[PDB]
Design a protein around this nucleic acid. Structure first.
Ligand SMILES: [Mg+2]
Lengths: 29, 70, 172
RNA sequence: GUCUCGAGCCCUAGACAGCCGGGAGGUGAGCUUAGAAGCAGCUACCCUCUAAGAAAAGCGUAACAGCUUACCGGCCGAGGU
């Protein structure tokens, strides 16, 4: 689990509140 | 129709030609307010939204010439 | 290893012994797929290529058999086509189809016509300076196209200067 | 060529390869030079937008252009190195 892939999800989720797999990952939670 | 960066620096500095090695040989000097004017002009030439980031691009040519800041 | 190829609706495939025949709207192609302990069979609407052996040499032919079958599928439906362009610098070259062979006259100013027989049910059609080799069997079509280009192969002189000859332009 | 055994690293948060799409602005970096704009040489090699995109890795031109490179995204789907 590369750290950049984790930091990305957090960055995506941060924008949802205010790669396709990472977008979905962020959507899920 | 706004001219390139290199020119505007030589205008508000006093010197024309740069140097063989940048940063290692300081030619001219620019102040805080002097660099703020250059960023005011170039708006379409730069992609930045804020006026803050526009200045960073300009400095990206100055230090690579020999221009200290005060 | 076992590989299953679902045959297209346009296509129908029969098989007896070591020979596989594939038919479609564009025609039929029959091939002999023979290699130690590699069984190729037609299980309804799927062609199966299997073997109990899994060494490098067996796996190689299995991959080869698959492409041969997929190509037969493609050839009996969409067909195979190669495009060729006839180029000449000084002497006007005459390329024509006479029976089951293409004839090239006046190549480099030669009196004697160069020629090559066409393989299988391959069709060669010429539109001025353009030629199009086509048919169901990629083996026969690919060879005919290559044969035409090879027919104008020059060994004796510098090719960078003497470049006349029909060349394969489009490959499927 | 082929068979067998071991170690490291990568991978279904999609690896390796292929194909498709993107490969962007400051500005042709500065110097040098009549000019050299990724790619003659010397030196620097910095920051914007962004999912990426070198002060340019290999060709290319008189110089540009142009073609690919890294780098990012997609299709695919299982091992790859
Ligand atoms: Mg000789």
């Amino acid at each position: 689990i590369p750290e950049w892939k984790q930091e990305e999800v957090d960055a995506i989720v941060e924008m949802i509140e205010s790669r396709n797999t990472l977008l979905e990952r962020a959507l899920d939670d | 129709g706004v001219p390139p960066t290199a020119e505007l620096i030589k205008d508000e500095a006093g010197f024309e030609t740069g140097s063989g090695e940048p940063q290692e040989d300081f030619v001219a000097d620019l102040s805080v307010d002097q660099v703020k004017q250059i960023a005011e002009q170039k708006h379409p030439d730069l992609l930045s939204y804020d006026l803050t980031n526009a200045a960073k691009e300009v400095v990206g040519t100055c230090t690579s010439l020999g221009v200290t800041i005060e | 290893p076992r590989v299953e190829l679902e045959i297209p609706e346009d296509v129908d495939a029969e098989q007896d012994h070591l020979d596989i025949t594939v038919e479609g709207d564009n025609g039929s192609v029959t091939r002999r797929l023979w290699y130690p302990d590699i069984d190729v069979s037609v299980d309804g609407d799927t062609v199966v290529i299997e073997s109990d052996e899994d060494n490098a040499k067996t796996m190689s032919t299995i991959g080869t058999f698959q492409s041969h079958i997929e190509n037969m599928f493609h050839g009996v439906t969409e067909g195979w086509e190669y495009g060729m362009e006839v180029f000449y610098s000084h002497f006007p070259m005459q390329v024509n189809v006479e029976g089951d062979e293409v004839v090239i006259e006046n190549f480099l100013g030669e009196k004697a016509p160069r020629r090559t027989t066409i393989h299988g049910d391959t069709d060669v059609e010429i539109d001025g300076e353009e030629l199009t080799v086509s048919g169901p069997d990629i083996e026969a079509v690919g060879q005919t196209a290559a044969d035409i280009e090879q027919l104008t192969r020059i060994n004796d002189k510098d090719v960078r200067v003497f470049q006349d000859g029909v060349y394969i332009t489009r490959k499927p």
